[PDB]
Symmetry: D2
Subunit: 316 residues, 4 copies
């Protein structure tokens, strides 16, 4: 029996990645799409073999044709609709970042617990074999003691920064199981419309440091390197996976005279995400990203904002 998904809006992330992945997925299916525009919803539904189209989110939430919703709305709309979906008895996969600040996630936790539904922030990377292999290799001692994590995530768009800043943070927290204690950061804003377009960050995790930069006005780039006393792990396509490059990691030894390449081509990380979610709904034991965790992640982002207003370290 398939977990039945409803899609809130015809947003591009849904159209290009998640909706086709749900149709591909073994244990779920999309039964409905909802948009303020019935015509748009119907058009997307027709394309992807979806039986139902609704002219409002509320009408889909009230329906019994879905068990769960996917929410690829802008961040400013995540809390409202995650809560309404849960209050309608639906399980929720909400796109990252879940919230604008950490405290906002308490109300989503309350909605999860009160309605006894699964609610999770959509960090597809944490279901990828690539990131599971980074985490296991570090845990097995393959790089010795981790001392530095270095990375970057940039792209170019001139018509938000949190939407990419979260990734170096979540991937490091996931791979290590640790939380940073303090942050130094420097953020630059667009001269005209005043939004944040660049940030350089150093996070002290005590035993190691994470350093990275993000930008919405630089040439496309993404990389993460986990560097220890006995080796390093280079993640080639850390965030957008197959949409960026090969789904692989390199493990280099201490001298660099030998490396191992581990390949995970055609991993379909969005499909893995929704399959893990469906298992979690069915059995309650599957590792899915917890809201508690989502909150810890957002605490780091909030500390990065605070650090950007000061000259030195800011406690997380």
């Amino acid at each position: 029996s398939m977990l039945r998904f409803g899609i809130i809006s015809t947003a591009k992330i849904g159209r290009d990645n998640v909706v086709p992945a749900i149709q591909d997925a073994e244990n779920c299916v999309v039964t409905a799409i909802a948009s303020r525009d019935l015509t748009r919803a119907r058009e997307m539904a027709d394309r992807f073999s979806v039986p139902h189209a609704f002219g409002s989110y509320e009408e889909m939430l009230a329906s019994d044709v879905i068990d769960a919703v996917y929410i690829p709305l802008p961040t400013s709309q995540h809390i409202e609709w995650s809560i309404k979906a849960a209050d309608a008895g639906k399980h929720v996969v909400c796109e990252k970042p879940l919230a604008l600040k950490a405290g906002d996630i308490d109300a989503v936790i309350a909605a999860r617990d009160r309605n006894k539904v699964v609610v999770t922030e959509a960090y597809m990377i944490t279901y990828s074999p690539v990131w599971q292999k980074v985490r296991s290799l570090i845990d097995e001692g393959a790089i010795g003691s981790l001392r530095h994590v270095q990375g970057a995530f940039t792209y170019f768009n001139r018509d938000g920064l949190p939407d990419i800043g979260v990734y170096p943070v979540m991937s490091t927290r996931f791979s290590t199981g640790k939380e940073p204690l303090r942050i130094q950061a420097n953020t630059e804003r667009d001269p005209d419309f005043g939004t944040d377009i660049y940030s350089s960050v150093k996070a002290d995790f005590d035993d190691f440091e994470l350093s990275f930069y993000v930008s919405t006005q630089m040439a496309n780039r993404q990389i993460m390197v986990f560097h220890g006393t006995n080796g390093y792990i280079e993640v080639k396509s850390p965030f957008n996976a197959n949409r960026w490059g090969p789904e692989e990691i390199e493990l280099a030894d201490r001298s660099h005279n030998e490396s191992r390449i581990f390949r995970f081509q055609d991993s379909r990380q969005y499909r893995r995400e929704v399959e893990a979610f469906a298992r979690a709904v069915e059995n309650g034991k599957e590792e899915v990203v917890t809201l508690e965790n989502s909150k810890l992640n957002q605490k780091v982002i909030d500390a990065i904002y605070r650090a950007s207003e000061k000259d030195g370290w800011e406690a997380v």
Copy 2:
């Protein structure tokens, strides 16, 4: 309006690649799956959001809930079902290789023309931006004069065909160059136990250049194609299985090798492009789709490779 696909059988190639690509595709959709085992069909249909499941191929063909069929059956069954589908008024995407012998394709051509439906062999690579770029770069003079094409396609399987991979170095070379080979030298080896072909090394003379490659069903997985000319070479990284093998990119190296250009086409979704091209062809009659005439020319090369494998020298195509 979506072109409506029916799937003949629950074969793995359909389940793993083509069916999800049709659902992802902008101008088509899967409305039915058919299998001798109805339970199997229904299970697949449920998974992929497909409204209809049929307990026989004949029943799906007779239905008006599909406009077209996809046929991922074994080669020995391609001709029979391609023809029956066309005679039922359905357009046909048939998996490669279309036939066992070039001559067998004449009856499929007759079915296409008699029923006025689109019938095509499913060479997904020809709809990939990667292979379109190889073809345009060669045509623009980026490697000077083409002199040699070198490649390989191997995997390991001992659960107990070679044509299913041998066709790819041949089709990709023909597609990229627009030429046909005149003659072939080849050497083929068989499995000691079950007697089937498990290895072939081939050289094909295209007059102005040669193609050399080997294929095997009992070697470590590898795939590569290199188009090498007087002024550069093009290395195709992931020529056949694309994203399932590696990066969807090519390298153009200059004459000296002191400079290369890398062209990337990540997440091209070549199976989706294939069915989208097919749907356009059904709707307008002008879209480049692999013609049966071209399929026949391709099979003529494979047939010549069989003949060459029984001789010590060159065999004319």
Copy 3:
């Protein structure tokens, strides 16, 4: 006519890289090696086809069989012997880092000018086609406006940190023609012997930031990436060149859908260094790293030490 080199000591950097490069070089040759241990000098001389061996540095400096010296002594001995060589009328190639403090370089400048000899710090990378191509590409607008330079230089040795920290700094200054204004850094010391074994640095160059880390107790790694609005340049083997990997750079465009690879295999950067030095001796016009530039570089390193003792930014 060949510029005749004398080698001060049988140090490993000389034996493994510079001495053979001088013999290979078109416009110079090694005529003498000097060591406190004459036997060692004679053994090295015999190996490399060098006619003279001396039992003291002073004796070689007094001789007319050399026109120039190469000095691969430890940093603490650079000033003394650079000055004595110049006062003996010899031109000087001194290994990096030239000095422990920027102010120490004034006496070397005085020796250069007083004796009218060429004196230069041995930044072999600045004579490499790789780094000349980075510089020209950035100057031509190939990456648009430079916004961030990210890199690393680490190796493992437990039997020092300035010897690698200078490289991210010099290569950035060389490639951009700019100086940093301020520095944030964090440095860690060996629990036992108290020396610096790790440093993470961010340098504000106003229009862009440089971030890097260095360590003498981590797996071998080296990389530099110059990242702008319209592309990025990745330098594959920035510092040790052929001893690390391919001598090449990748120029990626804004979208990453196309890159150019520029290759400079078998560049022999140490040979190119001494050839440039010999041309400078002969004509006075060749670009050679100036002591004034060496001093500017050391000012950055000094600022990194100072920054490591504070919470926030330190002015250079």
Copy 4:
């Protein structure tokens, strides 16, 4: 005590690679250079810190200032000067290819044995850690059973040979496997104007596996060798010119391709390793250096490639 080398001629291969490598080498040194043009010899000698320059080969061979010679003359001059050097009591490193025909090597063998000097053809690659690792990995079972070796060696030069590059795919395969080919199919093309050989495509049957490759003096620069087995494959990134071409490394891919190992040997200095091995062989008589007997077996393959190029099918080696 350093083995003292004399260089016969100021040829470019010596100037660019071997002479500086001898000066770098731990157990030898260049003491003399000889050329018909004394001024040229003296200029080179001055550059490389070489104490003696001679105005004829004969005068250097008669001198006691050298123990050994390096001979980077054109192939047509190798036999003459290898023999004269040995007859003058000097050990010989002669550039590849040693001879034009296999039979020509018998007189060099006679000179080696008669004078009790070390004489070897300069296959620097066989002293490289890269090729030693290929050989050991194959021997250890890392790729299972070897089934196909595929490669290429091309460059572009149009002003007034193919053997100078054809020998490399052959020697590297023979070295890595320890086997000899039994028969050859080949096709060779000649320059329309000057009539020399500018392109060959070759397949060599080693019984258990085949070697396929092409070489050309009129194509974009390329070099690669892949040793492909049941269990894996080994890709040699910079097989022949090593650091001059690219990274000195190999990739060992497993059966599925889901894991590879990269072995790196940066700054191997293969020419220095060659002369160091040669000096050890002169001093102790036990060091592996390429034997003239092995050189002859190699040339037998090349001679069979010429013969195969004149016929339609297989030619026995």
